[PDB]
Amino acid sequence: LYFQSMKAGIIGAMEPEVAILKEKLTDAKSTEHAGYTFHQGQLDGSDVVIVQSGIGKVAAALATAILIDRFQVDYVVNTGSAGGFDASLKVGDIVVSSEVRYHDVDLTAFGYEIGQLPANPAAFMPHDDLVAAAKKGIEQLSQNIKAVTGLITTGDTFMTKEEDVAKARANFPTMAAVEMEGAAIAQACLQLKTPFVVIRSLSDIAGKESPHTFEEYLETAAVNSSQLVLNMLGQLKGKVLS
Ligand SMILES: Nc1ncnc2[nH]cnc12
């Protein structure tokens, strides 16, 4: 009958990235702390807390901290949209983080790696089992989408200027996709000894077409990322993280 499951923290920067899972919430309760709105409930039996963070590093990191400190989630899933870097991937595809780095952190002047904050690893690491879970989570099939593991990077600039995309690409050649909150969530999670995984779907190919492509395909990327979350929640049912 009843599964014994962890409590999942689920975070998205904007309302569409979160609206779907917010809906399928059962026994919904919504609470407010420190300027954020947290939606506690269940998804197919599993206990979750869903928060829309706002855009950018600091906002995502603060929501994450409250998510962990106030609601004691066992792990954090960051979901949402991202700009594709990997040419193999096309709008709607999904990238599960295999690692996450900031692209807009630079303390190389002092010997740190590009993207790396002092007293932090160069790359934040998602839990293997959360990664493994979403890997199996690709029984995807709605009723076709590609889904991959790859490097995801994070900065506080929306990545549109051919020059910005080039510099990022040069520093982080293996990058599958880019967004504005992933590494910040991971940074907060590390600080709070909490497992994370970042799941993001391509709302655009990063570059000249990005602003209107993003607006066109945000709802698609929300649908696809939200689905892989639900599956991943299924794979984690009755399990605990190693
Ligand atoms: N091109 C882009 N840059 C940063 N974040 C994004 N999220 C979706 N598309 C993006």
From Swiss-Prot:
HAMAP family from the UniProt entry: Salvage_MtnN (MF_01684)
MF terms in GO: adenosylhomocysteine nucleosidase activity; methylthioadenosine nucleosidase activity
Gene transcribed to yield this protein: mtnN
Source organism of the structure: Colwellia psychrerythraea (strain 34H / ATCC BAA-681)
First-level EC class: hydrolase
InterPro entries named among the record's database cross-references: MTA_SAH_Nsdase (IPR010049), Nucleoside_phosphorylase_d (IPR000845), Nucleoside_phosphorylase_sf (IPR035994)
Pfam families: PNP_UDP_1
Pathway of action: Amino-acid biosynthesis; L-methionine biosynthesis via salvage pathway; S-methyl-5-thio-alpha-D-ribose 1-phosphate from S-methyl-5'-thioadenosine (hydrolase route): step 1/2
Binding site for substrate: G83, M159, M180, E181
Name the record gives this protein: 5'-methylthioadenosine/S-adenosylhomocysteine nucleosidase
Single GO BP term: L-methionine salvage from methylthioadenosine
Record keywords: Amino-acid biosynthesis, Hydrolase, Methionine biosynthesis
